[PDB]
């Protein structure tokens with residue numbers, strides 16, 4: 050029924066190699082790593098908690 | 100060398116009591132899961148046992164090992180009063196725990212409303228106040244002092260400090276501390292055992308395909324065997340002076356002391372308590 | 381009919397396999413490990429009467445909203461650990477809650493069909509329900525806000541719906557899940573979202589189009605939690621199965637899986653950090669876990685709660701991770 | 715900035731006071747659950763445990779649904795009542811969300827919850843019912859022959875087995891009700907449908923040595939009822955570890971004693987939970 054048509058429509062989509070996507074995600078994570086206060090310990094004065 | 104073994108035994112008993120009560124209190128206070136309305140009585144009993152094992156047990160051991168008591172008269176009176184307060188508080192707290200279990204089992208629907216954190220703290224405060232009233236007040240004002248010639252020089256002398264008591268205070272202290280809680284505990288445990296037997300019979304009848312007796316036996320017999328002889332000789336030596344000697348009195352009193360160390364071992368037996376002990380240690 | 385569907389599924393599987401050149405672990409094998417991280421609670425919250433199942437951080441890094449089975453949805457200030465609002469609920473059973481991006485509205489789900497939206501900022505400081513969303517024909521599981529007017533809900537009727545607050549009727553209905561949908565997470569651009577059902581299939585929806593663009597059904601057991609990567613091109617799915625998997629939108633396939641031998645329990649909530657390096661995941665066991673996204677290696681464990689952790693939350697500023705559990709007490713971790 | 719903090723703290727205090735006041739009521743009340751098929755008879759128990767034109771319209775809608783069920787049976791390969799056992803599931807029709815019930819017994823406030831799901835095959839929302847005192851399982855014991863395109867009773871046993879063995883409902887007991895006792899008696903007395911025809915174990919099954927039959931029950935009816943009860947109890951106690959128990963009950967279509975039975979069952983459940991918590995059973 051409509052499920053077959055929906056699956057056929059979903060199958061026809063552009064695909065980007067997993068290597069490129071993984072490299073882009075890793076690059077974003079490395080570039081924005083310093084902004085995260087969880088990875089780098091928060092200074093006591095700057096920490097809103099305690 | 101004979102007293103060396105007695106000193107070692109006393110030190111071991113004091114250390115065991117202190118360590119057990121400290122561990123029980125730390126487990127009860129550190130983890131919020133163990134914090135419960137019914138656990139407040141348990142931690143009160145643990146605090147009383149810790150206080151007794153810290154104050155009365157070491158000073159009593161020092162008095163036993165060395166005959167001379169080097170501290171002042173006022174300090175020895177304070178030590179005796181602390182001993183009485185701790186013993187009375189421990190027995191009253193055991194009675195209150197038994198009463199709480201009886202209310203929880205016999206009256207399950209009304210137990211939730213009857214018992215609350217404020218109610219539990221009020222009960223604990225009343226227990227400690229009534230323990231202090233029967234310990235601090237009659238001892239500091241010298242109401243328990245004897246009238247006969249003996250022990251008057253002991254009261255005057257700094258070295259001698261022994262538990263010599265008139266007729267009135269012994270019976271009243273026994274009734275306030277042990278005898279009434281004994282009767283209350285026996286009644287509220289017989290009722291609970293009857294309820295447990297009824298429930299087991301119902302289970303057996305409903306489904307074709309013991310522990311209560313052993314648990315009640317442990318809980319009642321440990322306390323009774325540890326404390327009843329001491330209070331019975333407390334009544335006796337006033338009823339008949341020549342019957343009771345000093346050594347029997349001291350050994351029975353120390354058995355009552357070590358009951359405090361035995362108490363958390365048989366009371367803090369819940370699986371949650373075991374998990375807390377494993378995590379802490 | 382079935383033959384064509386089977387052939388199309390085989391073709392899409394072959395295309396996904398062909399698009400798989402190098403795995404994420406192979407590429408990031410030379411990256412520096414995050415290392416052990418010491419996360420300890422700074423302020424522990426309390427006040428609830430029963431088990432909470434969900435919570436949501438505010439747009440500001442201060443306020444919280446949490447709902448429990450006592451029937452009370454109470455708003456908290458995480459900086460001072462003092463309650464701001466206490467909103468009683470018509471239904472004693474709830475399954476989710478949400479916080480408006482502007483902060484003026486709070487919406488909660490429930491085991492009943494009805495979804496309720498409450499007014500926070502009103503005259504004289506009175507809390508009241510603005511609208512009662514109806515007609516979803518199933519127990520609701522999640523709620524998120526696109527804006528102050530649009531809300532997307534997920535229920536047990538295997539359908540996700542997009543509602544309009546003013547009209548009170550769902551604008552668009554999403555269908556395609558064999559099992560019931562449990563969790564969803566919006567995109568930073570508020571134009572895409574994904575949903576994890578009970579059939580292990582996590583599908584991606586387009587709010588404007590109303591049709592599932594992609595479908596990721598690479599999991600084994602039912603999905604209990606889901607959340608976007610901060611970039612918006614990836615998302616991680618929690619499940620009753622111990623494994624936690626990170627999918628991809630541009631690659632259309634799974635990249636990494638997070639499984640350990642010791643953990644045999646389920647997963648209830650998953651949330652990334654601000655940078656996405658750390659993947660926090662609550663577990664059916666009393667402890668949660670922290671995973672290195674680019675290395676699939678655990679970098680910590682937090683066993684603060686005494687019951688099963690049901691909800692996770694990371695602030696928009698990324699300051700602290702707040703985790704609740706079936707124990708009434710909440711804990712803010714930093 | 716101090717004034718804002720003070721006002722917010724005062725608001726916190728007021729909210730906490732109101733929250734404690736509501737927590738008292740929440741702890742006072744108890745929670746229960748209704749569970750079973752639509753044809754099991756949960757509506758009959760709800761009426762027993764607790765707009766005339768609207769009622770007549772509902773009756774007309776039920777008659778229309780009966781006609782639709784007759785048409786559905788005609789799709790399959792007074793005369794339709796004999797074949798209605800294997801036909802589509804429908805109401806009796808022989809005349810020719812969530813539901814919350816709040817009732818109190820002996821000044822104890824109970825609160826009742828209905829399943830509300832007709833086709834909740836996954837039934838995974840059941841994990842949220844862990845604060846309930848008991849689960850009232852309602853099943854029609856007379857549905858041993860009405861098959862669903864396995865017998866309905868076998869489906870009930872499968873549902874009960876899945877519910878009993880749950881990673882979350884381990885501490886939750888189950889109250890069990892068996893409606894259609896008169897219907898079961900009528901169906902077993904007649905030879906149209908035999909228990910051994912669909913349940914082979916009944917041929918080798920014998921009546922229990924210890925059983926309590928009503929004065930107006932034939933031996934065959936008692937044998938069938940006790941066989942069903944024994945099967946349910948076996949499924950319950952096969953994996954039981956003493957944490958939770960099943961309470962079978964033989965109830966008729968109309969009976970006012972159900973509320974008292976639920977009260978007694980809940981009291982026994984609370985008593986046994988308290989006994990096991992303290993390790994006295």
Ligand SMILES: CN[C@@H]1CCc2c(ccc(O)c2O)[C@H]1O
Pocket residue numbers: 179182183186187262269272273276333352
């Ligand atoms: C010397 N130690 C005292 C003496 C008598 C006594 C004790 C405790 C509780 C009482 O009610 C008593 O009468 C003992 O701890």
